[PDB]
């Protein structure tokens, strides 16, 4: 077809490796992005697919919607500690541990790192839901399913 140079800044190009979208057709013309070839994947635990993934343009290999990355055992919740880093957020879980001797609780927080899909971009203080995926960096094991 033709290039979209809004996405591209890479020395490698970026393509979607699931489905060929690089074929020339006039069927990607006179349309915003809807008629353009995409890959889409449902998450079947009740996490409804966004619009953005389905009709989009964005190329990411580390989100379950546009990739073969899969959602497995654990699903947790947590807020947004910071939005810093590119396609990576920082989540903070907070829970309560109990101590028997004093019969009294304590507050303890896990500050964790996650890979946030370029679909979502939640503000600080928002609550996020996150699933269990294969390792994606040194610290990152999670992915963003949904945002509240």
């Amino acid at each position: 077809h033709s290039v979209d140079l809004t996405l591209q800044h890479e020395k490698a190009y970026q393509r979607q490796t699931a489905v060929n979208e690089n074929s020339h057709n006039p069927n990607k013309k006179h349309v915003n992005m809807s008629g353009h070839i995409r890959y889409s994947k449902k998450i079947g635990l009740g996490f409804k697919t966004p619009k953005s993934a389905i009709n989009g343009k964005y190329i990411d290999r580390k989100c379950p919607f546009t990739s073969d990355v899969s959602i497995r055992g654990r699903i947790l919740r947590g807020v947004v500690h910071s939005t810093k880093m590119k396609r990576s957020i920082v989540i903070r879980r907070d829970y309560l541990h109990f101590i028997r001797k004093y019969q009294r609780y304590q507050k303890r927080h896990r500050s964790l790192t996650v890979h946030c899909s370029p679909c979502f971009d939640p503000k600080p203080g928002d609550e996020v839901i996150v699933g269990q995926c294969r390792p994606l960096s040194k610290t990152i094991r999670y992915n963003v399913l949904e945002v509240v």
Binding site: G44, L45, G46, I71, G73, I75
Partner: protein, 258 residues
Amino acid sequence: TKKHLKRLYAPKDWMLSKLTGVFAPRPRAGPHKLRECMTLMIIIRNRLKYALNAAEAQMILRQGLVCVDGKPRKDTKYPVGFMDVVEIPRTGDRFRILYDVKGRFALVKVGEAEGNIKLLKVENVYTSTGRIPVAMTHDGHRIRYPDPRTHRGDTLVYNLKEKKVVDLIKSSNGKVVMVTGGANRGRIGEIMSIERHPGAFDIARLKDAAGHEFATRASNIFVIGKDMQSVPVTLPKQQGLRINVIQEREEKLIAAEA
């Protein structure tokens, strides 16, 4: 690779003792898992009593006088799990192992034409090469060409006289069903409901006869028959009904007065 097992770390459903010996047999891998199986030597020696010693069990089995699945075995250690027919033709007796009520291995005695029947639960179905469908079971048996109506977690009646599969039975609806593992072992009842939790274990609620409902995991369901009057195979000593602690003790005393 483990090649040794210690008596305590071994199941006490094999009913070994703390004292006498230090080791227990670790069986060769086969149809059944380490915890759910019972090794040949244990059966012959400690239960049937055709052997008084380890070496005597080798004497019988290596020679061959013993069959399981109707096939003769020259194996000293082999698993025997659940719904396995074992036949010693010298005695002329046919045992069918099962799960007795109260967590015990049952050894139940069957008419000769029932010992050609067997029931295998299906685990996965998949298409293999040539478009040839396969049901793989919980005993590792491969049923070529299963019915198009087969699903995961259903039973397939399996002729051991000549190998094939007659009509199936499903886990659908209320049907007479029994439990495997989970310490509700050998308890029989209807399926009242099947709960779903996707991405996690699927609870099922069973209701045994004379009420008293309860819950066990889908994974631990093993079908028996369509109905309790349509069962293909025998029940163990107790019918699949448990009783209260008080009543156990009461009956133990009543019989001891004889």
